[PDB]
Amino acid sequence: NRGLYNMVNEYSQRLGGHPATSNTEVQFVVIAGTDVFLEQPCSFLQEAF
């Protein structure tokens, strides 16, 4: 709700917050964020296909 340009900068700049991890059987939350990188447009506009 910070604005459209603020949300677009929040999308591309950093993680929106707490995505799934990589190469594990069950999906954890990544906390360090060392070598993972992703975008999530589902969290950007809050709907599911």
Binding site: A32, T34, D35
Partner: protein
């Protein structure tokens, strides 16, 4: 070699890989028959046409 980083991860040092490959020898053998008769003919001398 290895990229340096800005975030906090365990930085892998100057790695060096030693790998070796061994040789394979191959043997091949076929058998050809030669009778005793023509060999004993060969070990003689000719005098008749």
């Amino acid at each position: 070699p290895t990229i340096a980083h800005g975030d906090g991860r365990r930085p892998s040092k100057q790695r060096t890989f030693i790998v070796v490959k061994n040789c394979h020898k191959h043997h091949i053998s076929t058998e050809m028959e030669l009778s005793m008769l023509d060999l004993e003919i060969l070990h003689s001398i000719p005098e008749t046409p």
